Design a protein around this motif. Structure first.
Motif, PDB file in Angstrom:
ATOM      1  N   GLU A  44       4.873   8.581  17.507  1.00 12.71           N
ATOM      2  CA  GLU A  44       5.859   8.985  16.508  1.00 12.71           C
ATOM      3  C   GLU A  44       5.278   9.916  15.453  1.00 12.71           C
ATOM      4  O   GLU A  44       6.035  10.394  14.597  1.00 12.71           O
ATOM      5  N   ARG A  45       3.977  10.229  15.538  1.00 11.93           N
ATOM      6  CA  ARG A  45       3.292  11.084  14.565  1.00 11.93           C
ATOM      7  C   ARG A  45       3.431  10.489  13.164  1.00 11.93           C
ATOM      8  O   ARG A  45       3.703  11.178  12.180  1.00 11.93           O
ATOM      9  N   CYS A  46       3.231   9.187  13.095  1.00  8.74           N
ATOM     10  CA  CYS A  46       3.364   8.456  11.853  1.00  8.74           C
ATOM     11  C   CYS A  46       2.216   8.789  10.901  1.00  8.74           C
ATOM     12  O   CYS A  46       1.054   8.801  11.319  1.00  8.74           O
ATOM     13  N   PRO A  47       2.502   9.052   9.626  1.00  7.16           N
ATOM     14  CA  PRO A  47       1.409   9.358   8.694  1.00  7.16           C
ATOM     15  C   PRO A  47       0.539   8.138   8.422  1.00  7.16           C
ATOM     16  O   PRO A  47       1.023   7.008   8.317  1.00  7.16           O
ATOM     17  N   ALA A  48      -0.764   8.386   8.287  1.00  5.65           N
ATOM     18  CA  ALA A  48      -1.711   7.311   8.014  1.00  5.65           C
ATOM     19  C   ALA A  48      -1.445   6.604   6.690  1.00  5.65           C
ATOM     20  O   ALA A  48      -1.957   5.493   6.492  1.00  5.65           O
ATOM     21  N   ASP A  49      -0.693   7.208   5.771  1.00  7.05           N
ATOM     22  CA  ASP A  49      -0.461   6.590   4.470  1.00  7.05           C
ATOM     23  C   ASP A  49       0.900   5.906   4.366  1.00  7.05           C
ATOM     24  O   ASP A  49       1.243   5.404   3.289  1.00  7.05           O
ATOM     25  N   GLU A  50       1.668   5.846   5.459  1.00  6.44           N
ATOM     26  CA  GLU A  50       2.901   5.070   5.474  1.00  6.44           C
ATOM     27  C   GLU A  50       2.591   3.574   5.587  1.00  6.44           C
ATOM     28  O   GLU A  50       1.541   3.176   6.101  1.00  6.44           O
ATOM     29  N   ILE A  54      -0.588   1.441   7.390  1.00  4.82           N
ATOM     30  CA  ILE A  54      -1.455   0.603   6.558  1.00  4.82           C
ATOM     31  C   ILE A  54      -1.488  -0.827   7.085  1.00  4.82           C
ATOM     32  O   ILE A  54      -2.555  -1.455   7.160  1.00  4.82           O
ATOM     33  N   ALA A  55      -0.323  -1.373   7.420  1.00  6.72           N
ATOM     34  CA  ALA A  55      -0.265  -2.733   7.942  1.00  6.72           C
ATOM     35  C   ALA A  55      -1.055  -2.857   9.244  1.00  6.72           C
ATOM     36  O   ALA A  55      -1.806  -3.821   9.450  1.00  6.72           O
ATOM     37  N   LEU A  56      -0.845  -1.920  10.160  1.00  9.16           N
ATOM     38  CA  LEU A  56      -1.498  -2.017  11.459  1.00  9.16           C
ATOM     39  C   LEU A  56      -3.004  -1.905  11.291  1.00  9.16           C
ATOM     40  O   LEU A  56      -3.761  -2.652  11.910  1.00  9.16           O
ATOM     41  N   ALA A  57      -3.445  -0.995  10.422  1.00  5.96           N
ATOM     42  CA  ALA A  57      -4.873  -0.806  10.191  1.00  5.96           C
ATOM     43  C   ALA A  57      -5.502  -2.061   9.600  1.00  5.96           C
ATOM     44  O   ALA A  57      -6.626  -2.433   9.967  1.00  5.96           O
ATOM     45  N   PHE A 106      -6.750   2.782   7.203  1.00  5.09           N
ATOM     46  CA  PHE A 106      -7.394   1.731   6.418  1.00  5.09           C
ATOM     47  C   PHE A 106      -7.912   2.292   5.095  1.00  5.09           C
ATOM     48  O   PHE A 106      -7.803   1.644   4.051  1.00  5.09           O
ATOM     49  N   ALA A 107      -8.430   3.520   5.115  1.00  4.85           N
ATOM     50  CA  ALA A 107      -8.791   4.198   3.874  1.00  4.85           C
ATOM     51  C   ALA A 107      -7.583   4.368   2.957  1.00  4.85           C
ATOM     52  O   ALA A 107      -7.667   4.119   1.748  1.00  4.85           O
ATOM     53  N   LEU A 111      -7.017   3.492  -1.005  1.00  7.99           N
ATOM     54  CA  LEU A 111      -6.691   4.543  -1.957  1.00  7.99           C
ATOM     55  C   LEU A 111      -5.348   4.288  -2.624  1.00  7.99           C
ATOM     56  O   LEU A 111      -5.175   4.635  -3.797  1.00  7.99           O
ATOM     57  N   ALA A 112      -4.399   3.665  -1.912  1.00  9.04           N
ATOM     58  CA  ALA A 112      -3.126   3.321  -2.543  1.00  9.04           C
ATOM     59  C   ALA A 112      -3.345   2.358  -3.703  1.00  9.04           C
ATOM     60  O   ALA A 112      -2.647   2.431  -4.721  1.00  9.04           O
TER      61      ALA A 112
END
Length: 225
Positions: A44-50, A54-57, A106-107, A111-112
């Motif tokens: 889905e080209r999901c952004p790493a900061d969504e 974050i949950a999956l990481a 995970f980063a 950072l959030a």
């Protein structure tokens, strides 16, 4: 993956304490889910900061900590394996691009949080330099485990060497301003997630805090403890 794959990446002694070498149907199912969900997010080209990323990481890192039995040497070995093992993809579906995605998410999960503690210029420094030396941490934590396992004095020269290595890695992303670093310590005191995925046990963290206290002790002013 297969027991043959693990056999060639770990010694016989290591396999006796590597949880991944256990046949466990629930562990296998969880990894099928973690890999399948990562691949779907990437599709889905999901952004790493969504939040979904974050949950999956976070789920991945906790699983990896459990399934390496908290041994940073074993995290390192799995990191080597993912990038070099010829049948990694056929056997597990794991690719370097997947691991890059999980690590970036995970980063972003940290950072959030730091976004709520740092001003704009501090957060920008930390985002910019977050990955500069991230990969040096597993070898340091391995050495920290070893120092603590061997009851090394945190004030010995070797102990202070470890504290100096920690400082260089921490300053790599936190910067060198004492005022800024105190924000990081407060955040770490208040935010349990910031310490996740570090392969630190309470005992090793205590050993490190002692070595840092010796390193950073001032002649005058409130001391550590």
């Amino acid at each position: 993956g297969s027991m043959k794959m693990y056999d060639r990446w770990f010694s016989q002694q290591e396999l006796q304490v590597l949880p991944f070498a256990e046949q466990d149907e629930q562990r296998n199912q969880t990894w099928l889910e973690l890999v399948g969900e990562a691949q779907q997010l990437m599709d889905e080209r999901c952004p790493a900061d969504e939040p979904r990323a974050i949950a999956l990481a976070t789920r991945w890192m906790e699983q990896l900590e459990q399934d390496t039995a908290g041994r940073p040497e074993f995290l390192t070995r799995l990191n080597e394996m993912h990038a070099a093992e010829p049948q990694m993809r056929e056997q597990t579906g794991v690719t370097p691009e997947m691991i890059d995605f999980i690590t970036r998410a995970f980063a972003e999960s940290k950072l959030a949080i730091w976004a709520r503690y740092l001003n704009d210029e501090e957060l920008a420094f930390t985002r910019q330099h977050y990955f500069d030396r991230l990969m040096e941490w597993p070898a340091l934590v391995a050495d920290l485990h070893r120092a603590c396992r061997e009851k090394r004095d945190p004030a010995s020269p070797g102990g202070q060497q470890l504290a100096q290595r920690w400082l260089a890695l921490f300053q790599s992303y936190a910067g060198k301003d004492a005022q800024t670093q105190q924000k990081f310590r407060y955040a770490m005191e208040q935010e349990p997630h910031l310490m996740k995925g570090t392969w630190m046990t309470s005992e090793v963290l205590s050993w490190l805090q002692q070595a840092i206290g010796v390193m950073m002790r001032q002649a005058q002013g409130l001391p550590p403890n």
